[PDB]
Design a protein around this ligand. Structure first.
Ligand code: 8K6
Ligand code: 8K6
Ligand code: 8K6
Ligand code: 8K6
Ligand code: 8K6
Ligand code: 8K6
Ligand code: 8K6
Ligand code: MG
Length: 335
């Protein structure tokens, strides 16, 4: 069990991007596996790791990995100390005194982390920094949605609301516009609300909701979305689209799509893993949407037929890949 003592301060009560700074440092340290104690005066408990934070600080680093004793610094600032179990034999009940004694006893180097010291003046800056920490190599497409995430975070909008709203948007394009025969506009509707995923991802990262529920809902609503897309196609071409062979191929892809998702979900239930295959959910989505949009613009429908065939075949080999690897894992685990 790991313990982290952070000293109480006046600025921790301020709210930044939907949480308090107090809540932000607490949740950050919890994700690093520390149980957090806020203290006006330190009372030490028996434990393994001891993390002492004094100055008010916003930690911008995503994964904080603490291995071995060291001093935590960011750009010249000393944000906090990491002491081992030995500090239990030093600390006599006075804070500053016990720290300098332990510093005289042990020579520890300084490890660099991404963090900013809180001041009343630089709050705007911190906010700017925190938003940029959310991108994490995802690229320009992630960055352009940062003002929307900022807006939604300030308004008290939950990431689940964004996810649900995004899914209702996809369903509206797929189950309304497609059966009407509007393939182009249905597709731009689907396309617009598909990026809501990048928004909830930013928010889930910003608002600290990474939990099993969040993951569950994202997986589930993604399934609802993809199924709706094929459903609309199937319906439209069996009726007003007047193309049964395209409708049959679309229906086959729907089923094949479900089977590709269910293999992986079911494997994980068994403790195994099945993240493999040529066909990936977003990639499958993209080619279908592009073709359907094109057909909605007057392109010959055989373009969609070809794409559905290729997608059927790609789904089949993907299923084979997943089923094969879970078999290797299962048979190896029993022996
Ligand atoms: C389309 C206008 C959107 C207005 C949203 C107002 C939200 C304010 C709630 C603050 C709490
Ligand atoms: C037909 C209603 C469309 C607008 C729904 C707005 C829901 C606002 C929820 C605010 C709850 C606090
Ligand atoms: C803290 C999680 C709160 C989740 C709220 C979900 C509300 C969904 C809004 C849908 C509006 C249409
Ligand atoms: C929220 C969006 C989900 C709505 C799906 C159920 C609505 C069904 C309406 C279907 C209209 C199809 C009209 C075809 C005309 C030919
Ligand atoms: C006469 C065709 C009207 C089609 C309008 C579709 C509106 C869908 C709105 C979903 C919410
Ligand atoms: C909420 C769940 C919505 C799913 C409803 C799917 C609606 C199916 C649309 C059927 C309309 C077919 C148009 C027939 C014209 C002849
Ligand atoms: C690569 C799959 C084979 C494509 C055959 C589709 C023929 C479409 C003719 C209409
Ligand atoms: Mg998703």
């Amino acid at each position: 069990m790991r313990l982290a003592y952070v000293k109480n301060h006046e600025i921790y009560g301020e709210k930044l991007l939907g949480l308090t700074l107090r809540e932000r440092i607490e949740k950050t340290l919890q994700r690093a596996g520390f149980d957090v104690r806020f203290f006006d005066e330190l009372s030490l408990e028996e434990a393994e790791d001891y993390l002492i934070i004094l100055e008010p600080v916003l930690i911008l680093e995503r994964d904080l990995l603490l291995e071995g004793r060291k001093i935590l610094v960011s750009d010249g600032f000393t944000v906090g100390y990491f002491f081992g179990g030995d500090f239990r034999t030093v600390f006599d009940g006075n804070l500053q005194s016990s720290i300098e004694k332990y510093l005289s006893l042990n020579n520890l180097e300084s490890y660099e982390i991404w963090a900013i010291k809180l001041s009343n003046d630089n709050l705007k800056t911190a906010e700017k920094l925190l938003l940029s920490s959310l991108i994490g190599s995802r690229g320009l497409f992630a960055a352009i949605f940062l003002p929307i995430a900022r807006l939604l975070a300030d308004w008290g909008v939950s990431p689940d609301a964004v996810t649900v709203v995004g899914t209702l948007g996809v369903m509206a394009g797929a189950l309304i516009f497609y059966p009407m025969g509007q393939l182009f506009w249905g597709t731009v509707v689907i396309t617009v609300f598909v990026f809501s995923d990048i928004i909830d991802g930013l928010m889930a990262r910003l608002l600290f909701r990474e939990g099993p529920w969040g993951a569950f809902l994202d997986s589930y609503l993604d399934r609802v979305g993809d199924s709706s897309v094929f459903t609309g196609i199937v319906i439209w071409f069996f009726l007003g689209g007047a193309n049964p062979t395209i409708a049959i191929l679309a229906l086959i892809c729907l089923v094949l799509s479900s089977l590709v998702s269910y293999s992986k979900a079911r494997a994980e239930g068994l403790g195994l893993t099945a993240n493999v295959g040529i066909a990936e959910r977003s990639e499958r989505l993209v080619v279908v949407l592009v073709a359907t949009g094109l057909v909605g613009l007057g392109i010959p429908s055989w373009v969609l037929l070809v794409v559905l065939i290729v997608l059927a075949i790609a789904s089949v080999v993907t299923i084979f890949q997943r089923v094969l690897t879970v078999r290797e894992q299962a048979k190896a685990w029993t022996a």
